Symmetry: C2
Subunit: 213 residues, 2 copies
């Protein structure tokens, strides 16, 4: 669809790091649908601008300043999602994708009127909206994969927002604000939610943050 | 703010032609805040792509195919205005400006959900939203400057949407759907609207289309 930007790279690297601890060229390539050589050129570029750094062979993350630049973009991205979701009913599982076109043009005027009109400080998937400088409130949540059987918690945010992921979460009502109880962690993470028992596979579970009671 | 695009040129040339019959380099330069040499280069480019044509010395308009390409962009522009105006209350007089950032990313998904959610076929300033191919319903309106004293009419659309213009119209309630009566045309166009008498200066009046009864 649209031509890929620096901001799109920042966004996916930040997600991947939250999700699995690192970003690889191949993961970025596949997520952005950009050939690996271009991804390599952009990663080197981000590194020479002190926006990103190599963790070890083939693994990268954002620097602190890169992470705050990501956050300044995510303020636009997340508010676009709110706009699209609350105004016109773009489905919860589609709104991350549909926000792509309009997000670069979100001005502070639009962002702040949106925030105040709908009275929100999180995107539909529970992530906080960073302030204009790229800061975010520290939040007290943890990985759902860290909890033991019989722990109870509340879904906080979905840190990695893909298609397979959002769809599964939507289908099973595993959304921000939902109370859950851990039934099992063997092989999958099985939870009690809305009276139903749902097995969450590891690749999906890794994206789920929760707040314990 | 944002870097100027081909679409911005199409938009202003189309407006200027509706407004005064032609676009000059100097009018485009001032409207887009782009130096005259760059405007000259872009106009020549539009001409060599058969998107625009020279009327006479120093005066240009869009070709029919250029006008339909303009319309395809204006579908995005106008729906962005509706989104911004109806969702978050961006003021009627500001919404043309604020739409600038987000309009290029309006997808058909967003556009059509917006159109159907708010049930509109015109932008807040009364212009029709063209279809995806760049066609517009022919409309039966005329220039308010064409009417004689004692004619009655209804404001149809504001074809040229600047700051000085929209503000004056807003301030005086001269908006799409308002019934008016021509009192005078000497020097200004003076109308009866909402029980008040309002002189409309020529430079503003030229932007106003109406439908007669
Ligand atoms: Fe998102
Ligand atoms: Fe989100
Ligand atoms: Fe407009
Ligand atoms: Fe408009």
């Amino acid at each position: 669809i649209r031509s890929v930007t620096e901001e799109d790279y920042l966004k996916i690297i930040q997600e991947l790091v939250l999700y699995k601890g690192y970003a690889t060229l191949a993961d970025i390539s596949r997520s952005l649908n950009v050939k690996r050589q271009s991804v390599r050129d952009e990663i080197n570029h981000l590194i020479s601008l002190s926006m990103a750094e190599k963790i070890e062979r083939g693994k990268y993350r954002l620097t602190p300043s890169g992470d705050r630049e990501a956050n300044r973009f995510l303020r636009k991205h997340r508010t676009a999602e709110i706009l699209l979701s609350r105004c016109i009913g773009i489905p919860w599982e589609r709104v991350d994708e549909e926000a792509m076109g309009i997000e670069h043009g979100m001005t502070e005027e639009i962002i702040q009127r949106t925030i105040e009109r709908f009275g929100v400080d999180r995107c539909p998937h529970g992530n906080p909206i960073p302030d204009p400088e790229g800061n975010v409130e520290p939040v007290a949540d943890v990985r759902i994969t860290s909890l033991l059987p019989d722990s109870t918690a509340r879904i906080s945010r979905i840190v990695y927002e893909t298609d397979d992921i959002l769809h599964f979460l939507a289908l099973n009502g595993l959304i921000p604000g939902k109370d859950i109880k851990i039934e099992s962690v063997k092989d999958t993470v099985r939870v009690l939610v809305d009276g139903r028992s749902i097995e969450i596979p590891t690749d999906i579970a890794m994206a789920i943050m929760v707040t314990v009671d």
